[PDB]
Amino acid sequence: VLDGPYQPTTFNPPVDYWMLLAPTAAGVVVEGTNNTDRWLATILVEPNVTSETRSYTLFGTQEQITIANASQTQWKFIDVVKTTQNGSYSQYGPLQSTPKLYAVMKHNGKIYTYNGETPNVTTKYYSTTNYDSVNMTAFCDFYIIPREEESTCTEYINNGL
Numbered sequence: 448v449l450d451g452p453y454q455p456t457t458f459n460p461p462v463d464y465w466m467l468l469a470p471t472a473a474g475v476v477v478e479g480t481n482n483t484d485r486w487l488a489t490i491l492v493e494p495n496v497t498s499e500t501r502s503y504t505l506f507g508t509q510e511q512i513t514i515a516n517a518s519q520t521q522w523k524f525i526d527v528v529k530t531t532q533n534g535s536y537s538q539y540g541p542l543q544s545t546p547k548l549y550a551v552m553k554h555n556g557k558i559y560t561y562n563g564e565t566p567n568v569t570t571k572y573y574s575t576t577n578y579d580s581v582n583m584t585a586f587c588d589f590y591i592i593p594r595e596e597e598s599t600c601t602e603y604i605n606n607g608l
């Protein structure tokens with residue numbers, strides 16, 4: 448029933464499908480850009496991290512990002528975004544997670560990602576021009592779930608595979 452797992456790759460996912468990502472290591476989970484007004488990379492941060500600056504490879508280049516994770520026990524997925532090519536990266540929409548799963552979707556002129564704290568997650572979005580043609584690079588195994596089955600994706604984010 449569940450469509451996957453697919454191996455790490457860059458492709459152009461259809462609109463109104465969730466890319467359910469199953470990372471195993473801390474670090475960059477997924478990234479995508481329209482090359483004009485949106486870059487988004489999701490970073491997975493370890494439980495229990497006091498403010499510190501780390502180096503991440505985002506869109507092929509080293510970037511210094513100051514990260515934290517206030518939770519003693521839960522993972523933190525962070526959307527690191529910029530809105531112009533040479534802009535600074537800013538952090539939004541944290542998901543605190545036990546199951547270690549995330550998902551991203553292209554929908555209605557935006558990129559959506561999961562947010563909040565498992566097991567009661569919600570979603571939030573980032574307006575993105577030419578949203579439909581955004582290529583996503585997965586750095587881990589992933590699955591594909593139609594928006595019609597969002598309740599299934601939400602259950603996976605909340606409770607695991």
Ligand SMILES: CO[C@]1(C(=O)O)C[C@H](O)[C@@H](NC(C)=O)[C@H]([C@H](O)[C@H](O)CO)O1
Binds near residue numbers: 530540571572573575
């Ligand atoms: C312009 O308004 C919005 C948008 O994109 O539609 C509203 C949206 O709710 C908000 N999402 C979050 C997680 O904060 C988003 C980001 O602040 C911004 O895209 C970051 O670049 O801004």
